[PDB]
Amino acid sequence: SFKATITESGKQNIWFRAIYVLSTIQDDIKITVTTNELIAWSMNETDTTLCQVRFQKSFFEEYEFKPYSFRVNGRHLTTISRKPDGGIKSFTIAVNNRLIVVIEMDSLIVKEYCPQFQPIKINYICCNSTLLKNFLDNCNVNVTDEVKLEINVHRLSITAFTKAVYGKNNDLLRNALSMSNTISTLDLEHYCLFKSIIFKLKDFKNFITIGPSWKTDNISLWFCHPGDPILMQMQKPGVKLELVEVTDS
Amino acid sequence: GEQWYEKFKPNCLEQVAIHKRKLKDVQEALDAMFLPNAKHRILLLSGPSGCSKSTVIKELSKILVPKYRQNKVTEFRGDCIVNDLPQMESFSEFLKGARYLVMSNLSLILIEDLPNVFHIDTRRRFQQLILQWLYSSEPLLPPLVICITECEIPENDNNYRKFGIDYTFSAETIMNKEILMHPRLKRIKFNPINSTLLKKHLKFICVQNMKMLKEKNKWNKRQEVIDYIAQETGDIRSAITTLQFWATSSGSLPISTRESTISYFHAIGKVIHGSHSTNNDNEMINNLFENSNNLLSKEDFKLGILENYNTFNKGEFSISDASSIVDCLSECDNMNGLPESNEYGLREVRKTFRNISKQGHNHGTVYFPREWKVRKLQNSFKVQAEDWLNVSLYKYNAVHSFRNITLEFGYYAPLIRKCQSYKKIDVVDRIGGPIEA
Amino acid sequence: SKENLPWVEKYRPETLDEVYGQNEVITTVRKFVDEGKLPHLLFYGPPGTGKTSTIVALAREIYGKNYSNMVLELNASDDRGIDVVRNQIKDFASTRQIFSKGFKLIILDEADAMTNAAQNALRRVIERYTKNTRFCVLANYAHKLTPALLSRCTRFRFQP
Amino acid sequence: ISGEFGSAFHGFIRRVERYSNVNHIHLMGVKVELKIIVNELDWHLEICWNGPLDSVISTHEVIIRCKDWKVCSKLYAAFEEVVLAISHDESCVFHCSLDRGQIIYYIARSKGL
Amino acid sequence: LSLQLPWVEKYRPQVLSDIVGNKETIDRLQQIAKDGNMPHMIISGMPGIGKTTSVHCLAHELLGRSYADGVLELNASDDRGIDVVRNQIKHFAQKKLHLPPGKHKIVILDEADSMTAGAQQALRRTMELYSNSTRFAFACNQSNKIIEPLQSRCAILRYSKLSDEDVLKRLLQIIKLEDVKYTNDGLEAIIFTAEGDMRQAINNLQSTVAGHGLVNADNVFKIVDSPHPLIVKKMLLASNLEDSIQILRTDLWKKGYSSIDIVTTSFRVTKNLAQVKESVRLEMIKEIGLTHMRILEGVGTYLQLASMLAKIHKLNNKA
Amino acid sequence: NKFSASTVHLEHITTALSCLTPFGSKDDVLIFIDADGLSFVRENNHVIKIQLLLSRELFMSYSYRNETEDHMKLCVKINHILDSVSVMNRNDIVECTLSYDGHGSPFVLIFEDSFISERVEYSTYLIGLELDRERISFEAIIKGEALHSALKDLKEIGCKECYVYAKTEANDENVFALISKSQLGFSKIKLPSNRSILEKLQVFDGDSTTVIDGFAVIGFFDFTSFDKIRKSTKIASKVLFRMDVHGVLSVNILSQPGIVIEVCMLEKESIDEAAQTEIELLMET
DNA sequence: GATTCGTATC
């Protein structure tokens, strides 16, 4: 039926990073196969986020399909596609209720795995992903549970703050640690106001980290309203990235 | 093909085996937390297993949430072992993502399966996070519904630390004093389904399975077995499972249902006043020990017997019987938790109350022992005595033993300081407060 | 240097012919050895009646030379919690036998000192790996042994 | 403290400080060598000093606490001329001079050998 | 040193037709085997009455060639923590396996009475989420140790103690298949000392055959010992004190029984002991408790047991 | 002194004693002493035995001034050594001297930094798994790095239990694979037939004399025991496998006289042989 | 299990 093989190292790095991110979003990495492209999507139980990774036909050297959605455990798949220390030369993934994946190192040692699978059914911002990755990864998910993205008509400022909560007598049950940064409009590649948006940080960190895994660099953000979900996207030669997260009301 | 309790799930709240008052008191509350600027932030439902809590929540969220949706239920999954995240952060992530369900999104939250609360760290994290939800400074939040199944944890490997979740899985032993006593918290304790609702619903299941029931000629007997099942259990799911097992069978298999645990005051009343349908004290006490040894093997049970043995005929019985009861309790206190001690004490109490029980008795109401009050008073006394001793060294060099503080210095020294106060030192009032009667 | 020992652990029997008193137990275990079938034994009796002596002599007679790698002996002096039973005992009674063949022996001296969790874990080890391993449970007090553990053992009583 | 042996002897003196179960050190001198002996059930540690050592002028062993040895090391750090005197099973006298400003530290035995 | 499986595991039944005892329960299990709609079930009873064998036979007769990857037998010897429950059970239940039309996967949980409570809650979630594909079979000694939320989903089957006739029939089957010489009184003695336990009966029969050959009363009673609870009951119900003392001495003290064992057995016997008044029974329980305390503190001589018997006779003889 | 041995390459003793670390971290280690050298033998659960040997040519000085007994046997606690020899090297000769003065004497380890001599004395305590060389089911010679990668992957996966495949072929298509049974289930880790990695693989039919083709050898090993060899394979150059009929796996590791490691493993009883058919069918597929 | 009060039904 479906069969795909990647011979390029950076493509395998992107595949591994994407798989790890979808595993960190939900324990099950939902995967469906289309002759045009292979798309991997995941839905957190809270239903407040949605990330999809698209692998086009040109991504794989031979993306043959002879027909399909099947649910695969995320942790099992993320430990298969990992790069061992000290060089995978061919990653063949195929299905003909067991998924078959064949891995061979440069030293010709060959491994096969048989994971189980389950068949199932405004404004525009374009900023450098490097500076965004800098600020984001510098933040810690432990202290920060809330992101404040605000754009001024002159500068763009992003901060990793925390929603404070007070108890019986102004009790500091949760603090407001706010790691902040300010960025001028020269760094921002394309801004179109045609604004305050509040959402999470961990998923944003993982999605941002997905991109630069290819050593071959911008992220486009369109949004509106507080009760409506924000769109999030990045584009690669054979890889297409999407994230949809519900913004704070 | 499918389980009877799964294919016969009620399609509407008219089909649910719940009391009329219970349905009204849950509907009014659920509407109360639904309106914007709601007073009740969260709702807590507690009760035994299979008392139709989740079912009524399903139907109420089915015909209530759509009314307030601007232009369903969301459950927590403890099995979600997500990558890169520690287990203790799963509920944190769930709550952080579930609070984004206010505007253009509305879904009542049902925490049906709690996180693992037997681990003290994540239990404390659960308490802190649900308190942060309760004390939240957010302008508004989606309604929170939490269902707790009250079940007794049976005995296991001898290592018990929490002392609350390790003897009983209830809302009191999970949630702390602050959480339950909160203006924005609503608690509706549930009761086992009565025999009338069970009989009616079992009849409905039978009249929907007449062909098979008529096929095996068991329809001429279904009424007696339905009455027996309704009397045996107050569990709708267990009753339907037992009925399905009886119907699908083709023999004379006895109808056996899960045994429900006996509460604290239930056990106290069974020890004091006996048990109906069991005129044998020996067999009743034996079954009480086999089934509820976790509850009976405690000092709190002997304290409860001592505190509540005077509720028999409003203390209107012979003093010889009371002396015998307290004598046996004191003797049992000298056996250090041996099973023979509890057995002998309960047997003697039951025998004493049986030899004096007749008709025309008007008993009182039992109460929980006041020992914890005495422990808190003793702790306050210890704090006050420590303060007095601390003041009694730097002000004037003198070391006094604690026994003397309890005996003489807790009364005479405050008296002297009060006389000194009138003809004029920090500690002027009596230690432990005044005594009365 | 057997002249440098107390008389108690100087006249400890080395062979089954030197264990006096328990004629019936010794005869039955000798028959079990001769027939080649050894069940899961349980030796119970007062202290100093010949339980450890009997079991060690029997194991020496069954495995004359392989005794070091054919018998796993545990006692109260060794920790025998849930983890020990789960790991050490299972891994010993889960692997193939040394030299040509045989059945492995696991002697539990003073098993009344084991917790109920350890015995509850041990019962399925006893029932599952009985094809190539046999257990011996030595105990002075039988009320400290789980009824299932007593059920899956052949009882031999050592009289005074 | 300053010279070829300055860092070496300082390290030898402070090598006792890298264990958390060392409260009573046991100095020892044989007529020369300076041996710091630690007594524990784990392993009998026997730190010695192989470098040539002189005398200001038979065993001489004195058990003292470890804080006294810390004070001794601090004294040795800032003193060029240092004299270490030992009283068999009695006390340890740490004489430090600055050619004069003299420092003497009197240390009493903690345990009898 | 050789190769010969013990009769307990060599003769463990492989089909439900070879299991004796609770005829109605075994017939119901055979019906479940034929139709195939197995519900969640809890199996409880005394040890050695055919609970594990019933579960495994039902699994085999229900899954056939798919038994290899169709059952997940977890036992007390295996780790069964919350994490193990979650990971292993969830992955087994999520495994989509095509089975015959009326068939499900089976998750045998032997010794479920020794499982941590949080693991039981995780089992609750798994039971109520994957019930359409897999079913759970709990094997336990007492159903109290399974939490009420789990008993709510299960069809409780209670295995009663094996009657002497069923154990005699199984013994006769094993005898006529192993060719042992016997006497009727010998099999009666084996039945009597087994006390409703099939495993104990098989073990005692094999021990008698190995030790002496012919299975008569003399050989059985010279190799096996009469149940000491019966001796304790005989000594507690004795009319005069001299007879009770003599029974205690010659049947429990000379036989090499621990004093703590005698006291504990006396308490257990007194709990289930008819034909005695409630006051007399609780007085005997009190005296047994006092003697148990004296034994626990180290004074475990024969004098303490004789004194306990004397006090019991004082209370029950109006002396 | 009955035995004395000085060396300047303490890295050998460090790596050597780390090679016993995958075993019990808190237990006793048995040390033989003989003119050929001293060996650190360790055993776990009567089911696995490591044996690491330091030959006499390893030490610049090796005396063994004793003749009453051929070998000296002493048993010491492993973590006493591990705690004591935590010297952080120095840079100073750091020369290490091993001493033993017969029965009743401690095992001495002297460390000299040309001024400081931190002498440590270890208390000695009160005092098998060999494959029968005439019968070898299969013998394989693999390169160390490939085997290390295989165990690293198998540990990445968890691998509750492991299997060994050995089936030589008429056309010399020798196949050697490590089959696991984990959360994923059956994962086949097959090593290549190239002479770069696999330099020799002969599968016998008993007596280790007849090279028989077309038949496979299956070894059911507990992976907790199979992991004990992982750290030894890290320094190894060529790793030699030798499995007999009695279910004993012997690993012959030599980091080329260097150090020589002898890991012997007992193999699981394989209660059900249906898994054996499953494994061989997975292989031929 | 007991008491008190309130329902609902027959």
Ligand SMILES: Nc1ncnc2c1ncn2[C@@H]1O[C@H](COP(=O)(O)OP(=O)(O)OP(O)(O)=S)[C@@H](O)[C@H]1O
């Ligand atoms: N007439 C009925 N009314 C209500 N529930 C019914 C009825 N018939 C069958 N059921 C089923 O009975 C079950 C009762 O579940 P609930 O009591 O709502 O959940 P629960 O109270 O959490 O039970 P536990 O404590 O988790 S075991 C549901 O699965 C219903 O589908």
Ligand SMILES: Nc1ncnc2c1ncn2[C@@H]1O[C@H](COP(=O)(O)OP(=O)(O)OP(O)(O)=S)[C@@H](O)[C@H]1O
């Ligand atoms: N039947 C016997 N024949 C000869 N010597 C015996 C016999 N029984 C005990 N002994 C002696 O008693 C010593 C210790 O008895 P053991 O049998 O080793 O201990 P035990 O029987 O296991 O009692 P416990 O339960 O361990 S306190 C032996 O070394 C023998 O000298």
Ligand SMILES: Nc1ncnc2c1ncn2[C@@H]1O[C@H](COP(=O)(O)OP(=O)(O)OP(O)(O)=S)[C@@H](O)[C@H]1O
């Ligand atoms: N009814 C029976 N018919 C035939 N053999 C039986 C029967 N009951 C028990 N046995 C024998 O007992 C052994 C297995 O008994 P089990 O069913 O495993 O005991 P159990 O009922 O599981 O008790 P526990 O709680 O596991 S100790 C085998 O040797 C069987 O032959």
Ligand SMILES: [Mg+2]
């Ligand atoms: Mg429910």
Ligand SMILES: [Mg+2]
């Ligand atoms: Mg002994």
Ligand SMILES: [Mg+2]
């Ligand atoms: Mg069983």
